[PDB]
Curated annotation (Swiss-Prot):
Effect of residue 198 to I: In mut2.1; shifts fluorescence lifetime from 3.03 to 2.50 ns
Listed result of changing residue 149 to K: Increases fluorescence at warmer temperatures such as 37 degrees Celsius. In Esmerald; leads to brighter fluorescence. In VisGreen; leads to brighter fluorescence
Known tissue expression: Photocytes.
Biotechnology section: Green fluorescent protein has been engineered to produce a vast number of variously colored mutants, fusion proteins, and biosensors. Further generation of mutants led to more stable proteins (at 37 degrees Celsius for example) with brighter fluorescence and longer fluorescence lifetimes.
Pfam families: GFP (PF01353)
Key words, A-Z: Chromophore, Luminescence, Photoprotein
Modifications after synthesis and translation: Contains a chromophore consisting of modified amino acid residues. Maturation of the chromophore requires nothing other than molecular oxygen.
Protein name: Green fluorescent protein
Amino acid sequence: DPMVSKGEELFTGVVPILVELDGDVNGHKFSVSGEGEGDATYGKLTLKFICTTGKLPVPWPTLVTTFLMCFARYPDHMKQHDFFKSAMPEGYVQERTIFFKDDGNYKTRAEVKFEGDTLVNRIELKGIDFKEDGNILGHKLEYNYNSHNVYIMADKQKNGIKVNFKIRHNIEDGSVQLADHYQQNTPIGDGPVLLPDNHYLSYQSALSKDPNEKRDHMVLLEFVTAAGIT
């Protein structure tokens, strides 16, 4: 499929990744830069993020979903369902609202596209209505992350996809902090993209630290594979 081959070809090897985020949550302004690599053939990403403005004012785990669906491994049997690589290299816009149960929300707008050989994710994040002493701005979340499937559906009206899913962030005391995610993606360019049948992506994420890093930071290892059209 010469259509399906263009974007696929850009991901057959290890691809360098750059992430930039400008954030403000209840007026706490912050920036984060991240860098690493993606290997879509194995659905693997390796990333390190640094808060370049000091202390991150929210828990690292709450930003994991905001900080690259084009690196999912789509099995060969599902290659006609990979909107994300079909939109490359011109890229796609990824927008979310994320509602934290009994707290504020994030609203994010990102552009994901190639700049030369590097895949870039540039994000702007606004958070409103957070409780200063809540789980988010009070840093009450465990530094860890649960595996979750993500349900992708076609969004024909937007020439794109929509994505719905819930994240459960474990808490200090056995409770969970729910983060209800609403997402839509649309191509940046004007040409043909794939409109997939419904399927999911399976996510696993592992968070760690660099012992030599004195800045506030997060090392992220993710594995993501598509499934669910059997």
